[PDB]
Amino acid sequence: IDLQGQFISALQSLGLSHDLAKLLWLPLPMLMMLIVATVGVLVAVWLERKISAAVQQRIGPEYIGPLGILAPLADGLKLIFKEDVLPANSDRWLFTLGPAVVVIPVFLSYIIVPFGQNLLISNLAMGVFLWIALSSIAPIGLLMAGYASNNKYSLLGGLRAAAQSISYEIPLALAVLAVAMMSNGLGTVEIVEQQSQYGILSWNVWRQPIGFLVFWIAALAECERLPFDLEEELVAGYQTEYAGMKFALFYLGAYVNLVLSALLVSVLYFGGWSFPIPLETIANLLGVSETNPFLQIAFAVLGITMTLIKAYFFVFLAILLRWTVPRVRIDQLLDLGWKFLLPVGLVNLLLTAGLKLAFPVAFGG
Amino acid sequence: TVFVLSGYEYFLGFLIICSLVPVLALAASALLRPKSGRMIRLTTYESGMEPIGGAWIQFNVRYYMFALVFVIFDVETVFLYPWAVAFHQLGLLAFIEALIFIAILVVALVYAWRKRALEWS
Amino acid sequence: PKIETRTEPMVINMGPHHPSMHGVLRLMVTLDGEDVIDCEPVIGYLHRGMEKIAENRTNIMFIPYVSRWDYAAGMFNE
Amino acid sequence: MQLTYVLILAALLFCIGIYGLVTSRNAVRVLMSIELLLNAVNLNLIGFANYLDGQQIKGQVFAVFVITVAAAEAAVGLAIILAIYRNRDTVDMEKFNLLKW
Amino acid sequence: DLVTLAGQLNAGTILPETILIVTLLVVLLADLIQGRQADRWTPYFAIVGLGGAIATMIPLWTQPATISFFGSFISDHLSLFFRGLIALSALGTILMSIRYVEQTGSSLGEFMTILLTATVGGMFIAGAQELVFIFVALETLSIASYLLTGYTKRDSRSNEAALKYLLIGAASSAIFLYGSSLLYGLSGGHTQLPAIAQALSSESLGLVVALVFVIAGISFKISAVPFHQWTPDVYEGAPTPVVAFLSVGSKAAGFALAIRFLTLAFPSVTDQWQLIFTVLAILSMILGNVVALAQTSMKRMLAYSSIGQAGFVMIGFVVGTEAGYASMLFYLLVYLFMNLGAFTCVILFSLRTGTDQISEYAGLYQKDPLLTLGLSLCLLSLGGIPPLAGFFGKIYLFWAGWQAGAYGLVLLGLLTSVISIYYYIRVVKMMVVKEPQEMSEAVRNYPEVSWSSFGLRPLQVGLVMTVIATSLAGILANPLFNLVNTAVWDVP
Amino acid sequence: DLATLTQTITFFALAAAVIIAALGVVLLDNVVYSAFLLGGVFLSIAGLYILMNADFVSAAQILIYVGAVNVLILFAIMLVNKRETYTPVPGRWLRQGGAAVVSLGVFALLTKMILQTPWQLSSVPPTPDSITTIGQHFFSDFLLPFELASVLLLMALIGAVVLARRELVLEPEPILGEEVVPPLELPERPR
Amino acid sequence: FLNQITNYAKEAVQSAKYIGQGLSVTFDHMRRRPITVQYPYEKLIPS
Ligand SMILES: CCCCCCCCCCCCCCCCCC(=O)OC[C@H](CO[C@@H]1O[C@H](CO[C@H]2O[C@H](CO)[C@H](O)[C@H](O)[C@H]2O)[C@H](O)[C@H](O)[C@H]1O)OC(=O)CCCCCCCCCCCCCCCCC
Ligand SMILES: CCCCCCCCCCCCCCCCCC(=O)OC[C@H](CO[C@@H]1O[C@H](CO[C@H]2O[C@H](CO)[C@H](O)[C@H](O)[C@H]2O)[C@H](O)[C@H](O)[C@H]1O)OC(=O)CCCCCCCCCCCCCCCCC
Ligand SMILES: CCCCCCCCCCCCCCCC(=O)OC[C@H](COP(=O)(O)OC[C@@H](O)CO)OC(=O)CCCCCCCCCCCCCCC
Ligand SMILES: CCCCCCCCCCCCCCCC(=O)OC[C@H](COP(=O)(O)OC[C@@H](O)CO)OC(=O)CCCCCCCCCCCCCCC
Ligand SMILES: CCCCCCCCCCCCCCCC(=O)OC[C@H](COP(=O)(O)OC[C@@H](O)CO)OC(=O)CCCCCCCCCCCCCCC
Ligand SMILES: CCCCCCCCCCCCCCCC(=O)OC[C@H](COP(=O)(O)OC[C@@H](O)CO)OC(=O)CCCCCCCCCCCCCCC
Ligand SMILES: CCCCCCCCCCCCCCCC(=O)OC[C@H](COP(=O)(O)OC[C@@H](O)CO)OC(=O)CCCCCCCCCCCCCCC
Ligand SMILES: CC1=C(/C=C/C(C)=C/C=C/C(C)=C/C=C/C=C(C)/C=C/C=C(C)/C=C/C2=C(C)CCCC2(C)C)C(C)(C)CCC1
Ligand SMILES: CC1=C(C/C=C(\C)CCC[C@H](C)CCC[C@H](C)CCCC(C)C)C(=O)c2ccccc2C1=O
């Protein structure tokens, strides 16, 4: 089936000019992905709060709804009603647009992640470039907000957080390179197709086990899960200067980055829209599956369900390992990063190239 | 010339939609303010007292050196992208020359690691 | 904003809030980078004048004061 | 969309970079206009590889090499600049009048 | 590996550059592992590697001229001669820098890494057929000369000159890169210069604009009259072995790039830039040999003498005969040894005394006769005394200029040489003529007439070898003219 | 008809943004404002590279000239920050007028060169990919600059590490001559 | 020099085993019921 082709045929049967009819079709999924992203953010805030309560043997937020699920919605509806306060400095537009410069590209990078063969936005050539080069912008907004903060401690904390953030970009690119060499492509569709050709025996987690751990450590260092940079040299790193609106924007941006990383790690290594049993055997066992959509709709729902359970598993593992491993210093974190993830990533790329040039049978060829 | 590619209207439309929403949320927060802005006594954030020390930062080199090694390895990663892209029918001499490139940059990393090029003591 | 980075030692004034578990103490830390050179402690935000309380007070009227001397155990002063 | 408007924009960016190389009221804006002067020739090479070149593209390769060269030149220039603040007290270019005839 | 891909790659005309790269890697590894206590075998190992790189060009000399890396590098006798010239410059720079760097205070291996990098860049730019390869090698030499200027570690003169040199070099590199992009856009899309020069016979104004925009960045490297505004400030504040390398190696690299690029790119518009080169030489020789009469600093005097003597080489490039470039190839070969001796004597006089003012030069006939003897025998060769080789170069230069039909250029060159001999003889007048109880201070207490401390013997024997070479090249130059003339007929 | 119309509209808007931001870099009397407008110049020229044909070159443009070069520029700006009063020089108006007429003459000469020299436009469709051919050209035509860029970046990193060291140690050299040389200085002493 | 590398590898595998034991006791802590009280639904008995 094709909903876009049927909508185009219905608008042609109504009578139009085939250009303005096709122009306005894109904003409805372009807003639907945004509203389900805010739905996932409101899911993840309640999930993190209740799982942090269940780890420390207590109950999360209650007496707000049925079980307190409206509490992220109540927080997001209350924090936009607070009085926007400003410090005694200049450049008010810079202080306003700093968090805007932070919030724009991480929200913009939603055109990369897929949910199936057709349930995605853009897969042109190089979606990993459009993730990395857009995620490497937020230090500029962080330094801009630190300069407009007008403080001696918050500016130093913003400098330390920017130096922590820019160091974990190079193994984050090398772990992408180690998979893009084997997949001979930069788009996520070919990467997930080379994993969905076979079942469990074609997963990239068993082919590149060191690169998955390097990418996971780099993601946990980039989304500020284990580095506590929010006791940061007087009280906090880049805080204690904004109002409820800018703090809410930073909180939702951090949760968007966490959700996007938890989706992208599974997509690049484990693989959403996949099954342990191949779909061709089930399609041959059931009947004829080439035009009948009654099984294809259920297969698309099952692929969305597999992507959602993988994202929920990675989110639960990240927020379980937040309070499991103890807090380490940012100097020790930068030292372990630059002394571990770069050399083992380089020799992992070298052994990946050697295994691809030695036996090009089970790899991408 | 003609502009034919895989598509770029989604990127521009999503940029327009994602750039229209933060200033709209800021305008809504300014509209639903309790009274107004323009606080009568504007004070910066100090923990418990008045500013008694000074507005100066000690001259350091650790941030600039980290960003220097970051840009030096980023322009290496940029050159390392298309070799890994075009490694499907190219051969083994390109792998040898990329191994020489990787070994030269590993020698550069060893030179940066041995001396005091990055040290947050 | 006026943040002029110079080549002078930075005086860090830790406020008397300490919002983790500590009370009132104004710590002035003088340093020149990633170390600590000088430290000045300033107190006087919790002094209640207990010695003036016991000037005109008997033994049966001094028990809650002497228990509120130290708020960790208290029974050692009693 | 024609090549002539892109060439006119590249020439105007080159003249803006020339003026910001001459006056600049600073020493970091000199390098910031040097990046504009090289981004003008990057626009020139990208437009030439878009319009004149066909299948075998090489102006994009030259633009990538020019970008890497300008990043290395920016690193060398900032390494030159950051020693002047350690040695001298001021940052103004007009105060450097020691090496006379 | 495959034999067909290795035969189609033709990586056999690259071996001394790979030997120098391996030598750079071994020097960097020895500096990283051992440290500062291994500063007694590393420059001798680099000298051995430079000799092994310059000795393996003899099987490369008797070889047919083939292209390599799919029409990217061209190997001829001219490129081998320029590579040997750059290697002989670098070995003398090492021999003059061994004591000077350790007397400055920095580590020697970190300087020798950038010196070998500049040597590899010069050896790569001695060929440089491809346009992007020309830009990469030129910016490699430019970044090398940037980083070799600020070596004094917060001494004010070098870091005050390095920013001006960075500004002027970045402006010239932007102008040359805009001209290179224009020259790429004028053709159909080709990058190889025989493929570019075939479709450029239309006589457009954009060809002239691109020629001026390329020759501006070229003449910045040659340092002719309209771009000589960096060198009198650069040559004083920079350290002396750095400027001793930059006065000959970068100049020969710019001359080789100018010759090869103009020959392989413009065999149609030669008369348009011949008049420009006559104007540049006429202004440059006059401005150098008139400005250099009034300067009181010795290093600035040699700096302006470099500009005054760089204009004589342009007279051989103005003409179109086959004997014109042979004059430049002989004059650069003489000028290498002349500038090497004139820099070694200044390095010795500045390391044994301190500052090197002109009026301090009195009282050298009694303290050290060998130093003033070498300085006199080198400055007389720089002046044009007929027992020495500089006169033998200038006679061939004026003969080629009068044979091709340039009378006024030879007349102005003779007039500027007659003017320039007055300040060329002034250092000898301060040295060997001044009587006792006339010299200035800090001359009467010379403690170190003997050299026995930390490798002063290679610095002495390099000056001895330079003096013997510039004394024997004047009366005995019969194979040198044949070796020059056998590498000039290949240029069309 | 509509797609070319919106492409020309976005091209004219990006060109106007280039002009106003390049004016705001060199005319505003603040360094951080010129740095942020230079970042806006980088984003606008990245969109202009996206518009015509460039995807990988535009991605490298975004990555380098946003995440590394502009961040290092902002680091050098925030490191060198001190309040000083710019003294009035005796002559600046004639220098600014000379720079203005040089820029105007260069612009007029380049405009005459563009309008005089014609160009040969091609009528062939471009390739749908732009990473495969350039990835093939790094080992067939342009082979030696691929390693000379690495040697150049090695030399630049070595020189920047040398120029960026703190040099906390202090050790005097043995005397060689009459005047003692200070550590990490020049033997050529001024008068 | 190799003994320091083996000691670093032993410290790394010991840190990995400590991280695994922390994950094990964290997964163990999810089995027990919460021991808190509700207010004003489960008020304490005054002695
Ligand atoms: C812990 C974290 C938790 C996370 C949160 C979990 C809780 C939330 C989970 C919710 C599920 C997540 C969101 C689902 C995945 C995103 C799917 C999506 O975005 O998916 C986007 C989809 C579009 O996707 C696919 O798009 C296709 C078009 O693709 C084309 O376009 C695509 C680009 O859009 C690609 O380029 C693709 O290659 C190209 O072919 C077709 O439209 C397919 O039908 C469609 O499935 O948007 C649409 O669904 C269309 C938009 C609605 C339009 C309404 C339909 C129009 C009305 C038609 C009525 C017809 C009436 C006449 C009837 C005739 C009567 C006789
Ligand atoms: C008071 C307020 C009221 C609000 C009113 C709003 C009502 C309307 C919104 C309700 C949405 C919920 C209803 C569920 C609709 C799900 C339809 C579906 O998935 O429709 C499926 C179709 C299938 O799409 C077609 O599917 C085809 C078959 O492919 C599928 O099969 C292939 C097999 O190899 C491949 O795997 C391929 O990737 C996979 O997509 C092709 O892909 C075509 O391109 C594409 O058109 O998707 C489509 O068109 C796109 C449909 C987008 C739906 C995404 C919503 C998320 C799904 C709900 C979450 C699952 C919940 C299920 C709960 C059940 C619990 C037991
Ligand atoms: C909720 C409502 C919100 C409002 C809705 C949003 C409306 C937004 C889009 C309008 C819909 C109609 C137009 C789309 C429909 C449309 O007509 O597009 C289609 C058009 C051409 O597409 P195709 O070539 O596929 O179409 C023709 C083919 O069918 C055959 O040739 O796409 C483009 O022109 C891409 C333009 C991208 C241009 C390059 C990107 C520029 C990015 C610049 C980045 C700048 C950064 C700046 C930083 C300072
Ligand atoms: C980290 C350390 C890096 C140090 C540099 C590494 C050197 C390793 C290889 C040596 C290069 C020379 C090989 C010639 C030595 C030699 O003559 O070998 C012989 C052969 C060339 O033979 P010809 O085909 O010229 O045959 C000559 C005969 O016909 C005459 O009998 O070379 C090869 O087989 C080429 C393949 C080597 C592998 C590819 C090397 C070329 C790429 C290397 C990078 C080149 C640019 C370097 C400068 C930037
Ligand atoms: C066309 C003209 C070309 C001419 C070039 C000249 C070529 C010959 C130059 C040789 C003179 C240099 C040695 C004299 C120096 C000399 O005689 O003095 C000995 C020299 C100085 O030692 P000291 O006396 O300082 O020793 C320490 C003292 O404190 C204890 O007495 O020590 C050496 O052994 C240095 C190591 C030389 C190592 C030589 C290289 C090792 C072999 C390398 C194999 C290389 C393969 C190629 C590279 C991959
Ligand atoms: C191998 C292929 C390349 C060869 C090219 C030749 C380069 C030039 C020669 C340098 C080799 C090393 C000499 C180092 C010299 C060396 O290391 O010291 C050898 C020795 C000085 O050291 P002693 O052994 O006296 O010192 C022992 C110490 O322990 C006392 O402190 O003899 C000297 O007096 C040399 C005097 C300079 C004499 C220079 C003469 C150069 C030859 C000129 C031939 C002229 C022919 C003229 C015809 C008219
Ligand atoms: C099914 C998928 C399961 C994937 C789970 C893996 C995600 C765990 C990543 C750890 C995040 C925290 C990193 C903090 C790590 C931390 O803070 O300590 C790191 C610690 C640093 O120790 P030091 O500070 O002593 O070391 C530096 C000093 O030695 C300076 O000389 O040692 C490491 O460098 C070794 C790292 C091994 C790390 C191993 C991690 C994986 C352990 C779990 C293995 C699971 C196997 C599962 C098989 C089913
Ligand atoms: C068909 C279907 C369905 C179903 C579903 C399902 C069946 C699901 C399930 C599944 C699941 C339910 C999932 C989840 C999971 C999660 C988890 C469970 C996680 C956690 C864990 C962790 C993270 C841990 C860790 C660790 C490690 C790694 C080491 C050792 C130790 C431990 C183990 C602790 C529904 C109804 C929806 C609808 C649609 C369709
Ligand atoms: C290192 C050292 C040596 C060893 C140095 C010796 C081997 C001389 C080295 C000279 C080199 C070999 C000269 C190289 C010759 C070149 C071929 C010349 C070509 C360049 C010219 C154009 C100048 C001594 O002989 C010595 C003697 C007395 C006291 C101290 C020392 C001392 O410290």
Numbering used by the authors:
A (entry chain A): 5 to 234, 238 to 372
B (entry chain C): 12 to 132
C (entry chain H): 2 to 79
D (entry chain E): 1 to 101
E (entry chain B): 2 to 493
F (entry chain G): 2 to 192
G (entry chain I): 3 to 49
The authors write:
We purified the endogenous NDH-1L from the thermophilic cyanobacterium Thermosynechococcus elongatus BP-1 using a native polyhistidine tag on subunit NdhF1. Mass spectrometric analysis suggested that the amount of NdhV in the purified complex appeared to be substantially less than that of NdhS, which has a similar molecular weight as NdhV. This observation is in accordance with previous data that NdhV is a transiently associated subunit of NDH-121. We determined the cryo-EM structure of the NDH-1L complex at 3.6-Å resolution, which indeed lacks the NdhV subunit. Hereafter, we will refer to this complex as NDH-1LΔV. The first hint of the chemical identity of β-carotene was from the yellow color of the purified NDH-1LΔV complex revealed by the clear native-polyacrylamide gel electrophoresis (CN-PAGE) analysis. Absorption spectrum of the excised yellow band from the gel showed the characteristic absorption peaks of β-carotene, further confirming the presence of β-carotene in the purified NDH-1LΔV complex from T. elongatus thylakoid membranes. Given that we purified the endogenous NDH-1LΔV complex from T. elongatus thylakoid membranes with a mild detergent (digitonin), the lipids we found in the NDH-1L structure are very likely physiologically relevant and reflect their actual binding positions in NDH-1L in vivo, suggesting that lipids in NDH-1L may play important roles as lipids found in other photosynthesis complexes of cyanobacteria. To further examine the function of NdhV, we used the M55 (the ΔndhB strain of Synechocystis 6803) mutant thylakoid membranes that exhibit a complete loss of the Fd-dependent PQ reduction activity due to the lack of functional NDH-1 complexes. This activity can be partially restored when supplemented with purified T. elongatus NDH-1LΔV and can be further alleviated by addition of purified T. elongatus NdhV.
